[PDB]
Amino acid sequence: TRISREMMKELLSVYFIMGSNNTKADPVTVVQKALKGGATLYQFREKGGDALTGEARIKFAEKAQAACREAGVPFIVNDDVELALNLKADGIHIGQEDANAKEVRAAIGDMILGVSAHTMSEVKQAEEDGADYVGLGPIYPTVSLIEAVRRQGISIPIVGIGGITIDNAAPVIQAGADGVSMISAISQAEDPESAARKFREEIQTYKT
């Protein structure tokens, strides 16, 4: 069956997102360090400018997934449905533009489904479409909507994203989010493992 709302919320705590173009260091290493530091979920997001393509992209994907497995953390794929199914990913994340959430939900069985939402109505449609969690943002220039969502009684697991750092994360959890997702705060950090750990501890505190 679909993931439980309870387990989904726990997984979103420290949601690390990364592609090879998000770090000048070794990508596979930054991922291993983030997992070792305490990231609770990882999203493979290989896109934008100068991202890996073809076989090179697939190898990074398989290595990133292997690291998630050994660390016991779910592996989530951004956008690519075929890849998610081929690699047997733990789930997929999609945006509003190039994807029909309802059709994706039907194609992935009980895999975790994430959807980027930007409006109150998009949050509601994502849940209705079958999403297990919604990614809301950008929160910062890289929480009022989050507060508004919870105020109405919408209980879908929510993860904040967009310019989140160890110093502005707390307000996102207090607003009602179930976790924070980040890219550079960890991928570009001088000590990725340590950055992940701080986040891990910070979010624990505010959820507790």
Long-range contacts, stretch 25-28, CB < 8 angstroms, 24+ apart? 27/60, 27/64, 28/60, 28/63, 28/64, 28/67
Alpha-carbon distance 75 to 196, whole Å? 17
Q: Give 115's strand partners.
A: 94, 134
Q: What are the structure tokens assigned to 75, written together?
A: 């592996």
Q: What are the structure tokens assigned to 17, written together?
A: 């997102």
User: Does the annotation list 155 as a binding residue?
Assistant: no
Q: What are the structure tokens assigned to 208, written together?
A: 């507790």
User: Does the annotation list 142 as a binding residue?
Assistant: yes
Beta strands in the chain (DSSP E): 14-18, 41-44, 75-78, 91-94, 112-117, 133-136, 158-160, 179-182
Cis omega before residue 138 (within 30°)? yes
CB 107 within 8 A of CB 93: no
- Torsions phi, psi of 15, nearest 5? -95, 95
**1-208 CATH fold:** TIM Barrel (3.20.20)
User: Does the annotation list 79 as a binding residue?
Assistant: yes
Please name the method used to determine this structure. Answer: X-ray
Residue whose structure tokens are 């989050």: 146
Q: What are the structure tokens assigned to 70, written together?
A: 């050994």
Look at residues 113, 138, 141 and name the one whose alpha carbon lies nearest to residue 127: 113
User: Does the annotation list 183 as a binding residue?
Assistant: yes
Sorted by where each begins, the domain ranges of the chain are 1-208
CA separation, residue 153 to residues 21, 53, 56, 200 (Å):
38, 42, 44, 27
User: Does the annotation list 47 as a binding residue?
Assistant: yes
User: Does the annotation list 184 as a binding residue?
Assistant: yes
Residues in CB range of 198: below 8 A, 6 or more apart: 166
- Reported resolution in A? 2.1
Alpha-carbon distance 135 to 152, whole Å? 18
